[PDB]
């Protein structure tokens, strides 16, 4: 195939239970590579799993060909579940998002600020 991975400025971070590096993808002729299709080749490179691997960034140059991004590879799964930002755990579902606007949260708080002892119906009856 044309696609190829090459790492750069590798660093083994023990203070956060991961190894981080920069990723080069030499993929001429084709569109950008999907993130899924990258992370499994990193696995085969480091012999762990396509589950403790996270990748992001990935801007493509002018002219086609290369792209460069950032990648991290955790030791356990749960260390990733602790040390990752939540939205990056959401990308490949491992977390979920809730309340449907900033307005509703704001305006509930302002209605509740005008009652004492039990804020009651403003939450319990919406």
């Amino acid at each position: 195939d044309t696609v190829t991975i090459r790492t750069r400025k590798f660093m083994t971070n023990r203070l956060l239970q991961r190894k981080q590096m920069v990723i080069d993808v030499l993929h001429p002729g084709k569109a950008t590579v999907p993130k899924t299709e990258i992370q499994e080749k990193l696995a085969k490179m480091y012999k762990t799993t396509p589950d403790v691997i996270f990748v992001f960034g990935f801007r493509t140059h002018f002219g086609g060909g290369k792209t460069t991004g950032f990648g991290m590879i955790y030791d356990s799964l749960d260390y990733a579940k602790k040390n990752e930002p939540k939205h990056r755990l959401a990308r490949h579902g491992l977390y979920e998002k809730k309340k449907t606007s900033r307005k509703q949260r704001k305006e509930r708080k302002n209605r509740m600020k005008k009652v004492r002892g039990t804020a009651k119906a403003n939450v319990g009856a919406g």
Partner: protein, 188 residues
């Protein structure tokens, strides 16, 4: 509000003071024809980047020799000039900078080298090819006709590796017509 931005920007030309002067209009029109540029402004850029070099050269030449500042910045300015093929290493001194003409910065343009190194039929054909992404510097497509070619980049200019002119699928015209033989001349 405070904000995370750079407002820094600048102009890169200066209009001439005499707006309708024949000795000027005919020379600049000559320079537009001989290198295939677009406006007058494409010439006033080169005039600016030369008239600004010629101020640093002069202000250095009005320092006294052996100065630290003059030595350092002169050795830095000559290096920068030599490195783009505007000056000869057999000169390498400030009192020669004042002898450079505008038609040496114009000569090092990629449009000029793509014609003069043989890849195109004319100075106008060259500007079309560069703008159509047919040419490559060193493992890198480029699309800007005004790109200035560094001295040792010179022999890297060649046709792109994904392009009809040398190893590439025929374009959307050579393919629409070869299909007219199998879709317009076989059963159509």
């Amino acid at each position: 509000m405070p904000v995370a931005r750079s407002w820094v920007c600048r102009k890169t030309y200066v209009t001439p003071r005499r707006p309708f002067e024949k000795s000027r209009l005919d020379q600049e029109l000559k320079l537009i024809g001989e290198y295939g540029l677009r406006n007058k402004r494409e010439v006033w850029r080169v005039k600016f980047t030369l008239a600004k070099i010629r101020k640093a050269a002069r202000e250095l030449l009005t320092l006294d020799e052996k100065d630290p500042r003059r030595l350092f910045e002169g050795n830095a300015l000559l290096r920068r000039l030599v490195r783009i093929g505007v000056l000869d290493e057999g000169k390498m001194k400030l009192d020669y900078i004042l002898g450079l003409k505008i038609e040496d910065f114009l000569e090092r343009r990629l449009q000029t080298q793509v014609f003069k190194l043989g890849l195109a039929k004319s100075i106008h054909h060259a500007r079309v090819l560069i703008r159509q992404r047919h040419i490559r510097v060193r493992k890198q497509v480029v699309n800007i006709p005004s790109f200035i070619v560094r001295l040792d980049s010179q022999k890297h200019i060649d046709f792109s590796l994904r392009s009809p002119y040398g190893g590439g699928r025929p374009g959307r015209v050579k393919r629409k017509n070869a299909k007219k033989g199998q879709g317009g001349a076989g059963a159509g």
